[PDB]
């Protein structure tokens, strides 16, 4: 990877997985009869993974400005983030994407726990346009997690509404495998979502909504999509452009 | 013989714990759940046994049959104690010819189920 | 560590210039302050503020030590510091930087704390100053000391920690203290393993802290900056006999005011403020002004926000919050108290907001 | 209905798209049921 | 006291404290809704009963019992049923109509052949005159209301929020109205059954007021109770949290020893 | 103070009250004879010197006091700033139901409706 | 879906959501009974219980234990019967009719045989 | 029974069932409290809480901790006492009376003392 | 002196804690009455740091505590009264302090002799 980093290019590296690397290091050590600690790992099991992941970076202009991004995989056991290795690694990384079979069997795939997932880099790394129509998204989904147990007869219109966004929004973030979306394809859907253009639509149709919205936008509004893809930001005009094109599709 | 009248008992006793767990909700029961609750409670009680007192098969068989086919189901729970010995006492006294067939043959023929059926109803009426 | 002779006989507050801190969780001079909270809470901005304020108000330097550093954050800090000009390549710096990152081996990571501490201990003995020594993160120092122990083949203690764990901390902490020459005060980032305050690590560490400063996501989200939590950040130097009566009584009643408010948050969101007695609704409309006056614009954040920052001298923090508690600024609206200097900055700002 | 209720049919013919926002529409929906009781045992169930 | 247990044990309490804190907040808003129906009913109690104030009408007894079908609200039904038996001592043979099942269930067990009629589907929303007229109507219908020497409604009066009070109030049938001591002062013009109606309609009105007050007293109780549940499960959580950390910790040490001993040999 | 509906209570000092009593309209005031009267489904009005404010009403009870306080109770209730087509379309369905115990309730609607028309 | 088709994958996912919901509600069922439930929920639970049972099945090997003859079910019959169950086209049939039987044929057969 | 005899044997068992029931309910009472228990359950608890307090006994040696001069009950004394309570022959006595006293005679005493 | 004036005080408060932790139910003027005590009593144990009291000074406070001479005094005037009462005893009932400081015992002689100095200050 560093080859690319050192040479002004950019790579990304997936470690599948670090759990099993640690297991391996263990085998070598015990057999060499190096002294064991917690779970029979050597003292320098931390130092192992630190060395590894610290190598990932964004180099400065003088260095060719190359970069190496890291997707280490860590396998919890019954969800135990306190487990020795997960502890080490979590405290090395700049955040976690967190998966749960619970969410998975609900049918929410990717099965990403939002409440548990953070990116310490965060804001600074987001298509300004996506960050424009989503500063509200973490807000809404936060309050939807807090009024969730109210899903079981006599709720006031305020906390009723909150459950109306949440279900649709969560639905909007399901995504079949192998089908990643272009940014200019995300921002429309997240727009129609956040600004309440799905509250009318039923929760099962949110499926076919995405497919038909995007293909329509392609034919009848390929120009706004192009501006998003190119400018990477949203004009005050572009916001009325999208707004108008949505309200047209939602009416239709 | 024991097999024949013990048909499904173990599974039923499971269903019983099932309904008894749902009972903790203390929400009104219907005629189906109350039904199986009454029987499971009496079956449970019918299996209790004093130390040092092993029973012959032919003592076991009619007890189980009385419980399973629900002849015990209209009898107070504290009294099921006295039912057991009072029953056996009577079966020995009167229908000993059944008790000795069960033992010798180990299998309730269709007529033996009849005699036993009659014999139980008889006694339950007191 | 400075012998029992060279000891400070009296505890003493170090002025920081931050309202929240001085008023609620005042710092020990030559004391140790447990700093809590991850990212999204302006930790480094707050740190730089103290480096600036300890340099500006008192006249002592600061030493920032990166123990178990994530290198990324080392590159950020160093740049952000230049950007904030606490470091001045052309002029003068106020802070020396001693980094010891994750990638470095267990021996390195154990000693860096001492490496930095040594530097700071020079400014207290040679130049007789009141120096700030920062340690991020005091936990990973522990961690490292454990790895060293395992490699040296010593039997792990309870929960796999080094048998030496207590004394190891001692040797470190006991050099951080007041002498007759001067003082080293320390702000130390504290991570808490599995969220367990009973885990050996934090346990043994708290044994040396005199004050915790807890920044909070909840506090930043409400727009309050610094994002110090007024309720959690507790100082074990907030006693009447040592901060004086007037300071104490004020702070006490302030927390008490905010307490009653905190518990009323839930009945308000159900039956409205139509569900409060005369006395109850009075403090509630007032506690908002107090929770708004706790926020304070920073000098170091001036490049980020452009708003002129205020250092509030501790007597202001006292008398300001004093006059509010009695109800001397009730006719004054709430957006005056938000993001201002002392009480006279509320006065001048509310005259903007009026006519 | 009756006299007791006289003015609850005169108020419910006179109930029946304005003021009926919650208030009256609900004033119009009553979910009561009565049952007579005899020698412990009941009689039968019926809507009020 | 294994780790497996303590974990899930501690979970289901957190899950309970959630529900109980929801309950509290949900009742509080419901008490806002039933506050306005307890001022508008206790006001219609003014104009109505004021006529009586003059006639000073002073009282086969008809007791009407008021609660709801809902449990989960402390001793609302339990201690109302007791005051109903306290008063049901001095007339062992007094007819009862019950509104809400929980009271019916209570009395059905102790005065099993007193009750002649029973109502249900009540304490869900705030009671309205519509119900109060239909029940009064049915009390007139099958119950033969006016033909009773005496009628009293039993309800839970709300003294504060934390506490309520089992209460009684008299309904005054016709006849009595005609023999009103101060009835002569009112130049009320005998044109066909006129006191009958007033009775038939004071039975509905009084019942309402009772029901409104009873419900709004119950909601207050539910709120207060649920509130405390949250305090207790709150304190329990704290305890189990501490126990959890102990077990965890030891789990680590006992697990570790097993290895250490394994390793020395 | 004294004039209530089961959902909304209204008035408190009065100089003239007009009511639709059991037998024809009447007017209480300053000092009046203590009386109780069924209130027919009709309009009402309050006074405060020379203040005109008329309501409609469903019916109920009025009760003039010896201590002089007048108490008026009704169920449902501003005058024309409250209740034409809303009345018309309903009047249609009303008369229709009469031709149908069930249609008896409609008889009550005809009289109550016809009255409202005059307002 | 690429392997078993979408319909198969959807049934299988829904069945799973069902039981996942039913599991999640077992708190509220214990504490506040079955009474205190949304109507959609009440049905989801109704359907989840029916589904739990339809997942059991008498093995041939295990006749010594059930005394019930071994039933083998064809994969298409599985998916079809669960699909039907899921859309409510069987909400009337009692819980026991799904327990220890083969295909939906056997659910109907037992339903009548017991009601007889 | 072969040693202590059927009655002492049964007064024991019945006492234990009572206490064991109280124990089984410790959770519901902790969250829901008493009002959610049935009628038979409710009694058992008040009775068990009495049996429980009655099992406490002042010790002469421990006098410098109670204050009350210690008591020694006899075997025949104890069994009868408990049997009476298990026949509910004392239900009408405040739970406190059963606390820290000798035999059944001391309960009726302390209850008269307190009822003044 | 103290043991005499603190009869069972221990399990009083120790079973007072399990009671007040069953209130957050109904108005019960039996245990409600006994509550007014346990609060004034704990309010009475409250001791500011570096405040060493002498035995003779504690005895009269427990007196009024278990004898309930202070129930009619406001909850926020409990500890305040503690200072007021000792001011009253120090130059009046001086021998009461002196004799409890000499003996450490209490006769029925000093009992009524103090039961006059207590309700006296309840009025004044």
Curated annotation (Swiss-Prot), chain B:
Coiled coil: none annotated. It is found in: Mitochondrion inner membrane. It comes from the Eukaryota. Mitochondrial membrane ATP synthase (F(1)F(0) ATP synthase or Complex V) produces ATP from ADP in the presence of a proton gradient across the membrane which is generated by electron transport complexes of the respiratory chain. F-type ATPases consist of two structural domains, F(1) - containing the extramembraneous catalytic core, and F(0) - containing the membrane proton channel, linked together by a central stalk and a peripheral stalk. During catalysis, ATP synthesis in the catalytic domain of F(1) is coupled via a rotary mechanism of the central stalk subunits to proton translocation. F-type ATPases have 2 components, CF(1) - the catalytic core - and CF(0) - the membrane proton channel. CF(1) has five subunits: alpha(3), beta(3), gamma(1), delta(1), epsilon(1). CF(0) has three main subunits: a, b and c. Present with 41500 molecules/cell in log phase SD medium. This is ATP synthase subunit alpha, mitochondrial. The chain holds residues 419 to 544 of 545 of the full protein.
Swiss-Prot record, chain C:
It catalyses: ATP + H2O + 4 H(+)(in) = ADP + phosphate + 5 H(+)(out). One of its GO terms (cellular component) is mitochondrial intermembrane space. The lineage of its organism: Eukaryota, Fungi, Dikarya, Ascomycota, Saccharomycotina. It comes from Saccharomyces cerevisiae (strain ATCC 204508 / S288c). The chain holds residues 154 to 508 of 511 of the full protein. GO terms for biological process: proton motive force-driven ATP synthesis; proton motive force-driven mitochondrial ATP synthesis. ATP binds at residues 37-44. GO terms for molecular function: ATP binding; ATP hydrolysis activity; proton-transporting ATP synthase activity, rotational mechanism; proton-transporting ATPase activity, rotational mechanism. It comes from the Eukaryota. Mitochondrial membrane ATP synthase (F(1)F(0) ATP synthase or Complex V) produces ATP from ADP in the presence of a proton gradient across the membrane which is generated by electron transport complexes of the respiratory chain. F-type ATPases consist of two structural domains, F(1) - containing the extramembraneous catalytic core, and F(0) - containing the membrane proton channel, linked together by a central stalk and a peripheral stalk. During catalysis, ATP synthesis in the catalytic domain of F(1) is coupled via a rotary mechanism of the central stalk subunits to proton translocation. The modification Phosphothreonine is found at residue 84. Its EC number is 7.1.2.2. It is found in: Mitochondrion; Mitochondrion inner membrane. Present with 164000 molecules/cell in log phase SD medium. Belongs to the ATPase alpha/beta chains family. The modification Phosphoserine is found at residue 220.
From Swiss-Prot, chain E:
Changing residue 264 to F: In allele ATP3a. Changing residue 259 to T: In ATP3-1; dominant suppressor of the slow-growth phenotype of yme1 strains lacking mitochondrial DNA. It is a peripheral membrane protein. Its main location: mitochondrion. CDD domains: F1-ATPase_gamma. GO terms for biological process: proton motive force-driven ATP synthesis. Changing residue 229 to V: Lower activity. GO terms for cellular component: mitochondrial inner membrane; mitochondrion; proton-transporting ATP synthase complex. It is found in: Mitochondrion; Mitochondrion inner membrane. SUPFAM superfamilies: ATP synthase (F1-ATPase), gamma subunit. Changing residue 253 to A: In ATP3-5; dominant suppressor of the slow-growth phenotype of yme1 strains lacking mitochondrial DNA. Belongs to the ATPase gamma chain family. F-type ATPases have 2 components, CF(1) - the catalytic core - and CF(0) - the membrane proton channel. CF(1) has five subunits: alpha(3), beta(3), gamma(1), delta(1), epsilon(1). CF(0) has three main subunits: a, b and c. This is ATP synthase subunit gamma, mitochondrial. The lineage of its organism: Eukaryota, Fungi, Dikarya, Ascomycota, Saccharomycotina.
Swiss-Prot record, chain F:
It is found in: Mitochondrion; Mitochondrion inner membrane. It comes from the Eukaryota. Keywords: ATP synthesis, CF(1), Hydrogen ion transport, Ion transport, Membrane, Mitochondrion, Mitochondrion inner membrane, Transit peptide, Transport. One of its GO terms (cellular component) is mitochondrial inner membrane. The keyword Ion transport applies. The keyword tRNA processing does not apply. GO terms for molecular function: proton-transporting ATP synthase activity, rotational mechanism. One of its GO terms (biological process) is proton motive force-driven ATP synthesis. Transmembrane segments: none annotated. Disulfide bonds: none annotated. Mitochondrial membrane ATP synthase (F(1)F(0) ATP synthase or Complex V) produces ATP from ADP in the presence of a proton gradient across the membrane which is generated by electron transport complexes of the respiratory chain. F-type ATPases consist of two structural domains, F(1) - containing the extramembraneous catalytic core, and F(0) - containing the membrane proton channel, linked together by a central stalk and a peripheral stalk. During catalysis, ATP turnover in the catalytic domain of F(1) is coupled via a rotary mechanism of the central stalk subunits to proton translocation. Belongs to the ATPase epsilon chain family. F-type ATPases have 2 components, CF(1) - the catalytic core - and CF(0) - the membrane proton channel. CF(1) has five subunits: alpha(3), beta(3), gamma(1), delta(1), epsilon(1). CF(0) has three main subunits: a, b and c. This is ATP synthase subunit delta, mitochondrial. The gene is ATP16.
